[PDB]
């Protein structure tokens, strides 16, 4: 390692290198193996319907032009060498905005091997679209994907595959999403046909199951508590008009306020969610409580109060428990 | 789940190629000469977004020495992820770290150490931020392992203790005083159903609103926390106060 022979070798690897031409131009296609090391998934936004992903993206191919003899060890060159080499035109099809980290330097790896093999690594943060089905929200289970494709070259010129097969993607255990948990992940390889031709594609899919604890602590519990507060009106004597109507008006106002607060933090989807069904059920329950008091007031003075009051007291908890049981069995 | 941090980051390394003699002074060259020199491929592993400041010029330092030592300086503002255990919130104590690693070079090619020992990192004592206090900071050096090989790592860790003065005068004390005011219903006469029931429903609505104002600045976490337990306890107290008159 006199360090001048290395410079000569690297120089004559270049000096006749055309970056405009892929390896084996006009020959068989270049096989580019790919592997990913996931660092984290920072965000999963229902409003924007996308997720942010940070990863180490490693591509691996062979270029006979970059073959050297002599030096029997792998050359870990400076990342700037990547500017003077052909690299695959890989891109993420469903990305919305992505960048390569650039502090302190451009986070790039170039590693050559004596047989012309090239290992090219990047550190990429990317926001990727993920259409979500919120019909069963918040007891929903989403499928998100990252689609890797060649922009310029068809299958006649380039081919993609996963290095190590199912072991190509690592770091799935590193994900720490407070709202979600990754049930499963999958790798797929295929060819997609366009007007211009057939292009390679790789797909990395994740299945995310949402955690229900936050919505138990936020949505369901206040609704149940307000419904019970509505039930409290039945125990008060019938003659207390102000006391008995106050409970009804505050229950319905609180339920509507909960509805607005809940619906003003999600996309304006046109269909009904599970949370909407439960919320409307609780609303009609407090509504029936208020109308029960109104009907009693109409019956007694201004037209048995004890019998109907006792019947309401025994039946309302039973009916609400039955409704909750039916709902929770339906959505679980 | 992130902390922003501005810092002067300095690296020192010996290079025989850049050794000169006959000049008895250290040479401070223009920063753009860094484009013509090898520099280590250092990066921050837990980074989310960072940049080097560029006014009036790129805030960069290159300084050579006669023996061959090169001092390379940058001014970096970086946002770094810091997972937080908000179980004892706001009585929690967080551990936020910055991990520094070589991107390309394994331990066979490059080696990291903290220059100056434990006094490598300075200016931490002078930091002041409202919500937290830096109890302690630590420096660690390691050799992590991957499939490609073994890589150096440095770690600058801080322990942050949240100052519980804002929540005392926004969350705990209003909820407490609402609870004592809810207790006023007991002293009122029994036959004044309108007044007692009005007080009860107003206190319960108050507790629900104070619960709603919380948890907006907080993440969407599944588990319960200390402030949630306190608010639930006060809510149960006012609810039982209303059920008492019922």
């Amino acid at each position, epitope marked *: 390692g006199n360090m001048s022979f290395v410079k000569e070798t690297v120089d004559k690897l270049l000096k006749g290198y055309d970056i405009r031409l892929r390896p084996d131009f006009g020959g068989p296609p270049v096989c580019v193996g790919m592997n990913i090391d996931i660092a984290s998934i920072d965000m999963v936004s229902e409003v924007n319907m996308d997720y942010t992903l940070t990863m180490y993206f490693q591509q691996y191919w062979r270029d006979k032009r970059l073959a050297y003899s002599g030096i029997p060890l792998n050359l870990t060159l400076d990342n700037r060498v990547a500017d003077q080499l052909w690299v695959p035109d890989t891109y993420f099809l469903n990305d919305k905005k992505s960048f390569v980290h650039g502090v302190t330097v451009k986070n790039r790896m170039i590693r050559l091997h004596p047989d012309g093999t090239v290992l090219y690594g990047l550190r990429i943060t990317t926001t990727a679209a993920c259409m979500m089905d919120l019909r069963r929200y918040p007891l929903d289970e989403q499928n998100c994907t990252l689609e890797i494709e060649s922009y310029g070259y068809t299958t006649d010129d380039i081919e993609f595959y996963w290095r190590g097969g199912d072991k190509a993607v*690592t770091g*799935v*255990e*590193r*994900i*720490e*999403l407070p709202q979600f*948990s*990754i*049930v499963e992940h999958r790798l797929v390889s295929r060819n997609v046909v366009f007007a211009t031709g057939a292009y390679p594609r790789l797909s990395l899919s994740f299945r995310l*199951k949402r955690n229900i604890g936050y919505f138990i602590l936020q949505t369901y519990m206040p609704s149940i508590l307000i419904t019970i507060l509505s039930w409290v009106s039945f125990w008060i004597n019938y003659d207390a008009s102000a006391a008995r109507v106050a409970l009804g008006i505050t229950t319905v106002l609180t339920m509507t306020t909960i509805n607005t607060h809940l619906r003003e933090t999600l996309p304006k989807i046109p269909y009904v969610k599970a949370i909407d069904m439960y919320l409307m059920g609780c609303f009609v329950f407090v509504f029936l409580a208020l109308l029960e008091y109104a009907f009693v007031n109409y019956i007694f003075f201004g037209r048995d109060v004890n019998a109907i009051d006792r019947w309401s007291r025994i039946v309302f908890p039973f009916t609400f428990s039955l409704f909750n049981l039916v709902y929770w069995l339906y959505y679980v | 789940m992130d902390y922003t941090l501005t810092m002067y980051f300095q690296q020192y390394w010996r290079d025989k190629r850049l050794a000169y003699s006959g000049i008895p002074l250290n040479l401070t060259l223009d920063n753009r000469v860094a484009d013509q020199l090898w520099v280590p491929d250092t990066y921050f*592993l*837990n980074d989310k977004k960072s940049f080097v400041h560029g006014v009036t010029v790129k805030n960069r330092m290159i300084r050579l020495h006669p023996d061959g030592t090169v001092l390379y300086g940058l001014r970096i503002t970086t946002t770094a992820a810091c*997972m937080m*255990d908000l179980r004892r919130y706001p009585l929690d104590e967080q*551990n936020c*770290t910055l*991990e520094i690693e070589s991107y390309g070079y394994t331990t066979d090619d490059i080696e990291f150490y903290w220059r100056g020992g434990d006094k490598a990192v300075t200016g931490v004592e002078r930091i002041e931020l409202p919500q937290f206090s830096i109890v302690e900071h630590r420096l660690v050096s390691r*050799n*992590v*392992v*991957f*499939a490609t090989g073994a890589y150096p790592r440095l*770690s600058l860790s801080f322990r942050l203790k949240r100052n519980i003065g804002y929540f005392i005068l926004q969350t705990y004390m209003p909820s407490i005083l609402i609870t004592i005011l809810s207790w006023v219903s007991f002293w009122i006469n029994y036959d004044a159903s309108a007044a007692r029931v009005a007080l009860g429903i107003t206190t319960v609505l108050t507790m629900t609103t104070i619960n709603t104002h919380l948890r907006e600045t907080l993440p969407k976490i599944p588990y319960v926390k200390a402030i949630d337990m306190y608010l639930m306890g006060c809510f149960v107290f006012v609810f039982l106060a209303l059920l008492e008159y019922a």
Partner: nanobody
Amino acid sequence: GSLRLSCAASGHTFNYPIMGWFRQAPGKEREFVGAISWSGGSTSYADSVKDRFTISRDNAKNTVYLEMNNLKPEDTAVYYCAAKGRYSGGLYYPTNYDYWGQGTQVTV
């Protein structure tokens, strides 16, 4: 039959989200068996223990269970449980794990 090992942790477990089972027989270094995350939904296994051993995580109790079915003569070894930090990198390499268990023996 089947053997169920359990490893319980106590301390600053939040800073060490990843938990991992390793195995060591005499005359050879400790080898990776499996790994489990903080949430517990993501699990990893060695190549030669697929579908024979299984790992689960019980939070609150703060325990990890390794249930071992259809044991084999080569399974005789000392089994360890170890914890790994948030930014260590590499499940299969024991040097990335800071804290180790006791090494409970298993013979079949």
